[PDB]
Amino acid sequence: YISTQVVSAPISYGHFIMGKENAVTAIAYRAIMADFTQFTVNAGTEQQ
Amino acid sequence: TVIDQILNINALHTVLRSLKNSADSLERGLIHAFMQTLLRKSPPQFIV
């Protein structure tokens, strides 16, 4: 039951860099929302 | 990072604005020391 096969693997680390939004919330409110911009722009639309 | 840029530019403003405060303080101390010496020198009006 043992085989060897070729698998599409990642090679580099991911990123997550803050925005100005996250730096502002980190200083004012001691916290970070992740996906703060997607979160923001889906507010008043139907697809909350 | 964005937070490190925030703290860098805030520390730079703290240093610059404290230098401005110190220069203003030296000018007002010049005012006060000169007024101190005029009051040490000035005899009262009835004596004069």
Q: How far apart are the C-alpha atoms of A25 and B28, rounded to whole Å?
A: 40
CA B32, CA B45: separation in Å to the nearest integer?
A: 22
- End-to-end, the C-alpha distance of chain A in Å comes to 47
The closest of A38, A4, A42, A3 to A19, measured between CA atoms, is A38
Q: For B38, how many CA atoms within 13 A lie in the half-sphere containing its CB?
A: 6
From B35's Cα to the closest Cα of chain A, the distance in A is 46
Nominal resolution (angstroms) = 9.0
Report the C-alpha gap between B36 and A48 in whole angstroms.
70
B3 touches chain A (CB under 8 A): yes
A residues 20..39 contacting B (CB < 8 A):
20, 22-23, 26-27
Does residue A37 contact residue A21 with C-beta atoms inside 8 Å? Answer: yes
Q: Are A26 and B1 an interchain contact pair (Cβ–Cβ within 8 Å)? A: no
